[PDB]
Amino acid sequence: SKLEAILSQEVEAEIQALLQEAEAKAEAVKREAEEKAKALLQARERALEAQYRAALRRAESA
Amino acid sequence: LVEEALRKALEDRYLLAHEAYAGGVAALVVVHRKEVDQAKAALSRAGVAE
């Protein structure tokens, strides 16, 4: 039947829209997780090198 | 006479027939919600009752 095929089309269209929305969501999720992890790694070179340099400052002064 | 509205709807759709029990012919028409409600209004304009 026509509406046999049309309800099959509706199920396929809702599944395809569902998975496209899920693709956009998963891409934004891996984007935000990678941005947070790289903000971590960018902050850690500051948080470690500043400690190392201040240690050499006070060691040289001592 | 009632299937003119079904042909006015989607023709290869809308399973619409009368099986048996000739005291009153059980004209059942099944398509959808909204378009079937519009076609049911058109059939009641042609003369029909749920």
UniProtKB/Swiss-Prot annotation, chain A:
Domain of life where this protein originates: Bacteria
Similarity comment: Belongs to the V-ATPase E subunit family.
Function according to Swiss-Prot or TrEMBL: Produces ATP from ADP in the presence of a proton gradient across the membrane.
Name this polypeptide is given: V-type ATP synthase subunit E
Source species of the chain: Thermus thermophilus (strain ATCC 27634 / DSM 579 / HB8)
Residues shown, of full length: 2 to 63 of 188
